[PDB]
UniProtKB/Swiss-Prot annotation:
Monomer. The gene is Klf3. Changing residue 30 to A/D/E/N/Q/R: Little change in DNA-binding ability. The lineage of its organism: Eukaryota, Metazoa, Chordata, Craniata, Vertebrata. It comes from Mus musculus (Mouse). The chain holds residues 314 to 344 of 344 of the full protein. Sumoylated with SUMO1. Sumoylation is enhanced by PIAS1, PIAS2alpha and PIAS2beta, and PIAS4, but not by Pc2. Enhances transcriptional repression, but has no effect on DNA binding. Binds to the CACCC box of erythroid cell-expressed genes. May play a role in hematopoiesis. Belongs to the krueppel C2H2-type zinc-finger protein family. In 8.5 day embryos, expressed in midbrain, anterior hindbrain and ventral forebrain. In 9 day embryos, expressed throughout ventral anterior half of embryo including midbrain-hindbrain junction, ventral midbrain, diencephalon and forebrain. At 10.5 days, distribution is more widespread with expression also found in developing limb buds. Widely expressed in the adult. It comes from the Eukaryota. This is Krueppel-like factor 3.
Amino acid sequence: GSTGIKPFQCPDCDWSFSRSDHLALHRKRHMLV
Ligand SMILES: [Zn+2]
């Protein structure tokens, strides 16, 4: 049906997280801030 999209998504790997902190835990390696 639909794609496995989540409210918090990585625009780099196309990762999907149901939790904001989980996405941040992932995208921090993209941000390096
Ligand atoms: Zn990513």
